[PDB]
A paper describes a structure:
Binding of dsDNA to cGAS activates the synthesis of c[G(2′,5′)pA(3′,5′)p], a diffusible cyclic dinucleotide referred to as cGAMP, which travels to and activates the endoplasmic reticulum membrane-anchored adaptor protein, stimulator of interferon genes (gene symbol STING/TMEM173). Activated STING recruits and activates TANK-binding kinase 1 (gene symbol TBK1), which in turn phosphorylates the transcription factor family of interferon regulatory factors (IRFs)10 inducing cytokine and type I interferon mRNA expression. Likewise, embryonic lethality caused by deficiency of Dnase2, an endonuclease responsible for degradation of excessive DNA in lysosomes during endocytosis, was completely rescued by additional knockout of Cgas24 or Sting25. These observations support cGAS as a drug target and inhibition of cGAS may provide a therapeutic strategy for preventing autoinflammation and treating diseases such as systemic lupus erythematosus (SLE) with involvement of anti-dsDNA antibodies. In summary, we developed a class of h-cGAS specific and potent small-molecule inhibitors active in primary human macrophages.
The placement of a methoxy group (G098) resulted in a 2-fold improvement for inhibition of h-cGAS but not m-cGAS, while the placement of a pyrazole group (G108) yielded a 4-fold improved IC50 value for h-cGAS to 27.5 nM but a 300-fold reduction to 5.15 µM for m-cGAS. To explore the structural basis for h-cGAS inhibition, we obtained crystals of G108 bound to h-cGASCD. During optimization of crystallization conditions, we realized that double substitution of amino acids K427E/K428E facilitated crystal packing and improved crystal quality and inhibitor occupancy substantially compared to wild-type apo h-cGASCD. The electron density in the 2Fo–Fc map (contoured at 1.2 σ) for bound G108 can be traced for the chlorine-substituted pyridoindole core and the pyrazole ring of the bound G108, but not for the hydroxyl-ethanone side chain attached to the non-planar six-membered ring, due to its apparent flexibility. The tricyclic pyridoindole core of bound G108 was sandwiched between the guanidinium group of Arg376 and the aromatic ring of Tyr436, while the pyrazole ring of bound G108 was anchored in a hydrophobic pocket lined by the side chains of His437, Phe488, and Leu490 of h-cGAS. The pyrazole ring of bound G108 formed a hydrogen bond with one water molecule in the binding pocket. However, we also observed a similar reduction for G108, which although it has the ability of hydrogen-bond by its pyrazole substituent was not as deeply inserted into the binding pockets of h-cGASCD to reach the Tyr248. At inhibitor concentrations of 10 µM, representing cellular IC90 or more for the inhibitors against cGAS pathway, only G108 showed weak off-target inhibition of the directly cGAMP-stimulated STING pathway and the hairpin-RNA (hpRNA) stimulated RIG-I pathway.
Numbering used by the authors: 161 to 254, 260 to 287, 304 to 310, 316 to 364, 369 to 521
The structure:
């Protein structure tokens, strides 16, 4: 009964106990850069983004590297859509950050340079320094941009009441450049993704008692592990470098929308539920369409982002893994 999958989840768990002391190693360094960045005039309002502040690794199989976001409050921000890219925006103001202005557009590269220099004296999203990536993120308490109006389709799964509640929380903007226009900012909903993951069932008591243990989380871990295993095996063939755990997480949220009932995620159906996630992710690869869960018109599997041969290469390897009962999972 899917004994191979649960042995993979067990092996992954046994490599996540030495971090209870290795997270304090990272939590201490963060509070230093957090406390020292407040001495500068620009970053007076920085903070640890996640409410629980638990730093989530992009790689589920690399317990050594972490990823953390620094959030700074700013006066009322106004956005301008860049070249019909539904996620990239220029930032204006409706204050200390004026030193980074390039006319009206708030400069992303100017803020990174000063962000790098302050930490240096202690692709484009984060700077690195066990390993830790640190991404800067502008917090906007305004309503979510128009391109998010038909996203977050959780109404039949987490209820329209919860959706309306999540839309009231702020959204975030990280420096990211798309050509490669060096001055745009990209939308970020990492806080919404974390809240959905830890509050994932249609029942409010999902995974709060043994009678309601679902395998939603375990399926996502298996999807993350499958991709990381394939990316490592074929690291010398360049097609798989584009793919990341965010693509797998995005496709996972779509499968949750497609399967809104908790009964469709029974613990006993781990093999069937994981197979549902592999099939849907394969469909996204073949059709070259994996839309952002919050921005439906931002296709993460578009040609401009990931080449087509890479997608059919990953399709080839995933289908090979599925047909052979996943040899990357054994031993
Ligand atoms: O490592 C990388 C790639 O550099 N990623 C992991 C972290 C992350 N977070 C993202 C958010 Cl929040 C949004 Cl909106 C979009 C994308 C995105 C993914 N592919 N193209 C855009 C991402 C990514 C991607
Ligand atoms: Zn659950």
């Amino acid at each position: 009964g899917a004994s191979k999958l649960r042995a993979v989840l067990e092996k992954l768990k046994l490599s996540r106990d030495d971090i209870s002391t290795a997270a304090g190693m990272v939590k201490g360094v963060v509070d230093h850069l957090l406390l020292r960045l407040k001495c500068d005039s620009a970053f007076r309002g920085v903070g640890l983004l996640n409410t629980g502040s638990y730093y989530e690794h992009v790689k589920i199989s690399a317990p050594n590297e972490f990823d953390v976001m620094f959030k700074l409050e700013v006066p009322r921000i106004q956005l301008e859509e860049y070249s019909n890219t539904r996620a990239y925006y220029f930032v204006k103001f409706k204050n200390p950050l004026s030193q980074f202005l390039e006319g009206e557009i708030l400069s992303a590269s100017k803020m990174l340079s000063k962000f790098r220099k302050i930490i240096k004296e202690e692709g484009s999203p984060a700077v690195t320094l066990i390993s830790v990536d640190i991404t800067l993120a502008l917090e906007s308490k305004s309503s979510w941009p128009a391109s998010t109006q038909e996203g977050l389709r959780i109404q039949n799964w987490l209820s329209a009441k919860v959706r309306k509640q999540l839309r009231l929380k702020p959204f975030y903007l990280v420096p990211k450049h798309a050509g490669f226009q060096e001055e745009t900012w990209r939308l970020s909903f990492s806080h919404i993704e974390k809240e959905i993951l830890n509050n994932h069932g249609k029942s409010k008591t999902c995974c709060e008692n043994k009678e309601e243990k679902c395998c939603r989380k375990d399926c996502l871990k298996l999807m993350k592990y499958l991709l990381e295993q394939l990316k490592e095996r074929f690291k010398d063939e360049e097609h798989l470098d584009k793919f990341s755990s965010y693509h797998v997480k995005t496709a996972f949220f779509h499968v949750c929308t497609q399967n809104p009932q908790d009964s469709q995620w029974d613990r006993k159906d781990l093999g069937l539920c994981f197979d549902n996630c592999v099939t849907y992710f394969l469909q996204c690869l073949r059709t070259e369409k994996l839309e952002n869960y919050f921005i439906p018109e931002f296709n993460l599997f578009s040609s401009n982002l990931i080449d087509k041969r890479s997608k059919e290469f990953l399709t080839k390897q995933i289908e090979y893994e599925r047909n052979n009962e996943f040899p990357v999972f054994d031993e």
